[PDB]
Amino acid sequence: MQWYLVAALLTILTSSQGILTTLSQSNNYDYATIPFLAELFKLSVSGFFLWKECRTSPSVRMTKEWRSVRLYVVPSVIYLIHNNVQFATLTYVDPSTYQIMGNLKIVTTGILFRLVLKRKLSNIQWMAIVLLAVGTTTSQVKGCGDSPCDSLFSAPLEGYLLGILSACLSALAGVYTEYLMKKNNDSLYWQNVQLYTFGVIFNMGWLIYGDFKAGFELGPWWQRLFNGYSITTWMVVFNLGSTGLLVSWLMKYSDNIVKVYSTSMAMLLTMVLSIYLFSVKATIQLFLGIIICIISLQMYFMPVHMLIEL
Amino acid sequence: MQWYLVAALLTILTSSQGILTTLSQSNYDYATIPFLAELFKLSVSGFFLWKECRTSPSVRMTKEWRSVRLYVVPSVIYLIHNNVQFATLTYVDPSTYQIMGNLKIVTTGILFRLVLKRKLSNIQWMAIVLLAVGTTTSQVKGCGDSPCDSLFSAPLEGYLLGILSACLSALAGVYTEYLMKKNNDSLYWQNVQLYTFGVIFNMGWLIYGDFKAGFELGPWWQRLFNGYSITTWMVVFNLGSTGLLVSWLMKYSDNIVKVYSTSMAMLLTMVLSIYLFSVKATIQLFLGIIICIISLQMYFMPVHMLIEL
Ligand SMILES: Nc1ccn([C@@H]2O[C@H](COP(=O)(O)O)[C@@H](O)[C@H]2O)c(=O)n1
Ligand SMILES: Nc1ccn([C@@H]2O[C@H](COP(=O)(O)O)[C@@H](O)[C@H]2O)c(=O)n1
Numbered sequence: 001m002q003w004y005l006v007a008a009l010l011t012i013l014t015s016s017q018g019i020l021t022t023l024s025q026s027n028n029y030d031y032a033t034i035p036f037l038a039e040l041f042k043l044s045v046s047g048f049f050l051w052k053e054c055r056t057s058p059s060v061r062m063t064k065e066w067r068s069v070r071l072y073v074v075p076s077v078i079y080l081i082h083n084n085v086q087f088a089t090l091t092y093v094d095p096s097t098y099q100i101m102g103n104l105k106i107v108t109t110g111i112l113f114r115l116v117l118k119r120k121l122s123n124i125q126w127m128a129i130v131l132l133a134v135g136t137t138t139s140q141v142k143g144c145g146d147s148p149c150d151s152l153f154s155a156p157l158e159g160y161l162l163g164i165l166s167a168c169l170s171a172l173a174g175v176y177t178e179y180l181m182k183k184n185n186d187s188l189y190w191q192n193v194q195l196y197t198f199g200v201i202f203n204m205g206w207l208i209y210g211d212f213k214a215g216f217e218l219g220p221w222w223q224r225l226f227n228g229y230s231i232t233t234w235m236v237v238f239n240l241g242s243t244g245l246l247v248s249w250l251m252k253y254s255d256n257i258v259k260v261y262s263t264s265m266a267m268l269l270t271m272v273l274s275i276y277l278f279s280v281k282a283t284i285q286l287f288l289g290i291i292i293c294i295i296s297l298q299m300y301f302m303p304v305h306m307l308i309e310l
Numbered sequence: 311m312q313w314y315l316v317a318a319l320l321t322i323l324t325s326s327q328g329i330l331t332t333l334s335q336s337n338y339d340y341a342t343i344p345f346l347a348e349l350f351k352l353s354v355s356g357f358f359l360w361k362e363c364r365t366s367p368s369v370r371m372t373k374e375w376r377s378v379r380l381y382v383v384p385s386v387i388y389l390i391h392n393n394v395q396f397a398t399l400t401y402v403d404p405s406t407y408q409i410m411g412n413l414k415i416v417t418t419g420i421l422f423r424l425v426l427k428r429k430l431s432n433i434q435w436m437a438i439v440l441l442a443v444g445t446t447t448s449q450v451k452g453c454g455d456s457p458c459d460s461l462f463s464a465p466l467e468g469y470l471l472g473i474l475s476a477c478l479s480a481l482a483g484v485y486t487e488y489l490m491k492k493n494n495d496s497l498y499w500q501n502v503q504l505y506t507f508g509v510i511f512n513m514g515w516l517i518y519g520d521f522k523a524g525f526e527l528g529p530w531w532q533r534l535f536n537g538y539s540i541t542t543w544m545v546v547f548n549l550g551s552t553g554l555l556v557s558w559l560m561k562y563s564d565n566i567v568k569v570y571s572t573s574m575a576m577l578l579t580m581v582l583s584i585y586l587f588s589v590k591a592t593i594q595l596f597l598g599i600i601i602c603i604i605s606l607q608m609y610f611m612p613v614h615m616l617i618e619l
Contacts, residue, residue, distance in 0.1 A: 027332065028404055028457050091528030094537040095337055147539030148337050156532060219400030223465060228403040230456030 003254045007262045010246040014266035017239040019273060024236055029228030032210070033221070034237055036203040041241035042248075043200050046192030053189055062190045071180060072194040076202040078173040083206070085166045092159030097150050100140045101163035106133035106264065108171035109256045116175045119255070124307070128300035129257070135296055136264050139271060139289025174256050181252040188252050195248070261297065268293060313563045317571045320555045324575035327548040329582060334545055338537030341519070342530070343546055345512040350550030351557075352509050355501030362498055371499045380489060381503040385511040387482040392515075394475045401468030406459050409449045410472035415442035415573065417480035418565045425484045428564070433616070437609035438566070444605055445573050448580060448598025483565050490561040497561050504557070570606065577602060 025031075054060050063069070089098055110129040113119050121129070142150055181191055207221035250259050268290055274280040299307070363369050372378070398407055419438040422428050430438070451459055490500055516530035559568050577599055583589040608616070 027335070088527055091533055096537070147541055148537055156528070158528070218397055219465070219467070224400060228405070228457050232456060 003250070003258060006246055006249055007254070007258050010243055010250070010259070010262040011266045011269065013239060013243045013246070014263055015269040015273065017236050017243060018266065018270040019277070020232060020236045020239055022278070024230060024232035028230060029233050030224065032207065033225050034233070034240065036200070036207065036225075037237045038240040038244065039196050039199040039203050041237060042192065042244050043196035045241065045245065046189045046196060050187065050189035050193055053187060060190070061184075061186045063184055063186050068184065069194055072191075073198050075173050075177050075180070075195065076198045078169055078176065079199075080202055080206065082166065082169040082173065085162055085169060089159060089162040089166055092156045093163065094148065094150055096140075096142065096148060097155055097159070098163060100137055101160075101167070103133045103137045103140070104164060104167035105170045106136070106260050108167045109174060109260050112168075112171045112175040113256055116172075117178060117256075122304075124304070125300050128296045131292055131296035131299065132261065132264055135289045135292030136267060137289075138292055139268060139286050141285050143283045143285055171256075174251075174259065177248075178251045178256050181248070188248065191252070192245070192248050257300070261300070264293060265297075313559070313567060316555055316558055317563070317567050320552055320559070320568075320571040321575045321578065323548060323552045323555070324572055325578040325582065327545050327552060328575065328579040329586070330541060330545045330548055332587070334539060334541035336541075337539060338542050339533065341516065342534050343542070343549065345509070345516065345534075346546045347549040347553065348505050348508040348512050350546060351501065351553050352505035354550065354554065355498045355505060359496065359498035359502055362496060369499070370493075370495045372493055372495050377493065378503055381500075382507050384482050384486050384489070384504065385507045387478055387485065388508075389511055389515065391475065391478040391482065394471055394478060398468060398471040398475055401465045402472065403457065403459055405449075405451065405457060406464055406468070407472060409446055410469075410476070412442045412446045412449070413473060413476035414479045415445070415569050417476045418483060418569050421477075421480045421484040422565055425481075426487060426565075431613075433613070434609050437605045440601055440605035440608065441570065441573055444598045444601030445576060446598075447601055448577060448595050450594050452592045452594055480565075483560075483568065486557075487560045487565050490557070497558065500561070501554070501557050566609070570609070573602060574606075 050060075086098075089101075093101070106129060110121070110126070114121060142148070177195070180195070181188075184191065211218070211221055247259060250256075250262075268286075271280070271286050272290075275282050359369075395407075398410075402410070415438060419430070419435070423430060451457070486504070489504070490497075493500065520527070520530055556568060559565075559571075577595075580589070580595050581599075584591050
């Protein structure tokens with residue numbers, strides 16, 4: 001119920017789906033179908049709570065007018081375009097280069113927060129947003145004697161340009177979602193229901209397109225849907241659903257910058273946990289990135305009188 | 311130089327590329343490795359051919375298009391095979407697909423008799439089957455395995471294509487043996503022709519893939535080295551190595567020695583995965599090994615040793 005508990009919980013669970021994905025990714029299923037099931041989980045859990053809210057509550061705010069309902073399409077259109085850009089990018093860059101260009105969403109959300117959401121940021125705060133992006137990048141940077149030597153700056157221009165466009169779309173999606181939640185006095189569960197309906201539709205249309213690409217002659221998406229699905233596979237479907245509901249909560253009762261701080265701190269926690277479990281070699285880059293990020297946290301969230309005291 | 315040392319070495323190295331693949335499958339494209347692996351074999355064969363011509367008084371080499379053009383066929387089969395493999399996986403989970411893979415043992419068996427016209431005793435036929443049964447046994451999904459593959463409950467297309475896949479797989483191998491043994495030619499010249507067409511077709515595949523997206527995205531040659539770790543290069547060499555041994559066996563041995571090596575590699579991988587990846591040893595592993603060890607004895611044991619005390 002407090003934004004900082006939800007944000008902390010999102011951090012805990014964003015790193016859970018991180019580890020559970022790799023474990024489940026032990027050589028058996030389709031990660032094309034999970035986002036569909038993950039959306040279906042969110043759509044049906046939101047609908048449940050909407051139903052329960054209508055039967056429990058004297059008044060439930062719900063804008064049924066197509067003027068406002070149709071606007072929940074946009075995020076899905078952005079995310080569709082985003083997925084094409086992501087796929088396009090990876091045909092110029094190795095996934096590590098792509099993973100590290102991903103920290104640009106922190107600055108692009110920053111900018112669109114100001115531009116689209118028209119919200120005010122101090123200079124100290126702007127410097128924190130940048131520090132966060134720099135701090136996360138720092139932890140990811142390829143250390144000495146790393147077998148996949150990514151020759152820096154030596155990737156094709158298309159790669160760099162698309163990586164940048166990817167981050168702008170990623171940010172735009174999140175920032176537009178916040179707009180939708182906060183533009184209405186409506187119920188969180190009704191906003192979710194509309195949002196995640198269009199997501200289900202578009203996820204589904206994607207899989208139908210994929211089947212169209214092979215002339216519908218091969219196996220259809222609905223038949224294949226459950227193939228290889230272990231328990232761990234189902235854990236991440238729920239886990240991806242869970243975190244997605246928290247993101248919506250924060251889109252309503254918080255902001256994108258709290259989101260990207262949660263997401264960023266999850267990525268650091270994952271690396272810290274990977275040392276004890278997957279036994280990954282701890283590096284100075286991890287150490288440094290954490291300190292930058294902890295300080296980036298304080299800068300942005302610390303009350304401005306605490307910044308100035310002894 | 312002795313077939314049984316090469317076969318044993320192929321077993322050792324077929325399981326090496328097995329582990330090294332998963333370890334490296336930790337950043338790259340497994341679409342491009344077969345291309346580099348073929349290039350390695352083509353250029354290592356060419357090297358030894360060159361060296362053989364400069365070292366040897368006489369080198370047997372049939373340059374006539376009548377016989378050179380026949381080295382295309384394996385590549386055409388393997389191309390069709392890869393389409394079938396991809397098609398299959400859109401009806402079945404990879405485990406179901408992996409376990410249907412033991413049918414290549416019986417399909418090589420049959421085509422050995424049909425295409426290569428070679429003679430098998432009944433004891434030998436029973437060994438070929440036992441091998442396929444023994445490998446399947448080790449793979450079978452044990453109690454409390456999270457991906458519960460509802461047996462027999464897959465689509466018909468899946469089962470039918472899995473079967474067709476095995477026939478093509480076998481046909482490719484059996485036809486290769488035909489090519490090696492139909493000539494008195496140099497191993498290195500047979501490799502050079504074989505692996506030239508393989509390079510060409512591997513390359514045409516990647517060009518097709520780029521055509522499928524209108525050549526608008528990243529081209530295969532630019533992308534070729536992306537994500538390539540040292541580990542990645544180890545399996546490229548390792549996949550090249552084993553492939554040269556397969557050719558040796560296509561010439562101076564037979565497909566059945568191949569599939570015994572491949573099968574025993576798959577068992578060794580599971581045994582090694584217990585100490586390294588710490589996979590839980592099962593009775594199915596234990597049973598499959600005993601079946602396979604006995605399947606080995608049956609096929610290779612001299613028939614007087616089978617009958618003594
Ligand atoms: N694999 C995926 C995953 C998501 N998407 C897009 O993202 C949207 C789903 O929303 P989220 O995944 O952001 O919850 C869909 O509208 C879909 O177009 C996709 O096109 N391919
Ligand atoms: N990923 C792969 C690997 C091989 N192949 C096919 O297999 C042939 C290469 O032979 P090997 O890789 O079996 O030595 C090529 O002609 C190619 O058409 C493919 O089409 N896609």
